[PDB]
Amino acid sequence: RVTKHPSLKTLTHKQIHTTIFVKSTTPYVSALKRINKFLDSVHKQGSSYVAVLGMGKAVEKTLALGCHFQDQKNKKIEVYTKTIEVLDEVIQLKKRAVSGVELRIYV
Amino acid sequence: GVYYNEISRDLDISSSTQCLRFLKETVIPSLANNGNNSTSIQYHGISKNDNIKKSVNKLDKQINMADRSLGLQQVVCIFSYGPHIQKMLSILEIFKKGYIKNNKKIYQWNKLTSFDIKQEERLKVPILVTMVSDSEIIDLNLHSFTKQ
C-alpha cells in the first residue's frame, strides 16, 4: 500500500501527441476541450485517430466521452478493452492488474 | 427520465435489474440478428455487485455450451452499462486470461452506445456490448462493432 507506481507506457514521440490519458480527477468539459484540440492537431501529426485511454475509476467517464463524440459530433470510434500492469510497494515491488479501455476517436 | 436512440423509455437508471433486461430485450437485438445465421448466443449481463470468480466460471460454461454435433458456433454476449462497466471489464479480461493459457484463441467484438438521461441536461450513460467466440468468423451482423 505504501506507494503505487503508474503504468509503463511504451509510446513513440508521434504517439505522445496523439494519445490522451483520462484521470479520475479530470472534469468532463476539460476532457472534451482537450480531445477537440487533439483532433485538430492530429492532422499535422499524420494519424487518423486520437487515442483516449482510461482505467479503473475513470472507465465510465472515459466511455461517456466516447459517447459524446460518436453521437453529438458524428465521429467513427473503435473501442478496445485493456489490461494494465501496475507496480505497488507494501514492504518489495509487487505486480497488480487493473482493467481499462482504449478509445480511438477518428477525425 | 431515460432515453435510448433519441426515444424516451420506461427505465430507472438506478435499477440494474431493469436496465440490463432492456439491454437484452431491445438494445442487443437492435445490433445483432441471430435468426438468419448459424450462431448460438448466450447472454451475460453484469452489475457492479457481481462476483468475479463465479462470473468467470459461468462464462467458461457458457462458451462450451452449444452442441458440438450440429456445427454451431458458440457466442457469448457480455454486456453492461454505466457504473457497472468496470466489473464487466475485470470479469471479461480475467476470462480471456484463463482462456489463452491453454494455447487457445478468443475473438471479441465491442460496441459502445449510451443512455441519455435528462436548461435541459443531457448526460451520456455508456453501454458496452462485447461478443466473444472461439470461432474467428461469426455469422452475426456486427459491422458497427470493433474487432479485438
Next chain:
RNA sequence: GGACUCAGUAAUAUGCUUUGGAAACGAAGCUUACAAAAUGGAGUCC
C-alpha cells in the same frame, strides 16, 4: 439460480478553479489512465 449492501473530489456535463477589468471582455489551467472492488474484491437475503 434470483434480489441486493459496501468505494463519499466527473465534488462543478463547454462547465470549473485561480486571475485581470468599473464594465465590455480577457488570462492561466483543470492528461502523461486505477477505487487494496484483479492473488479470479468484500459481504447480505431467498
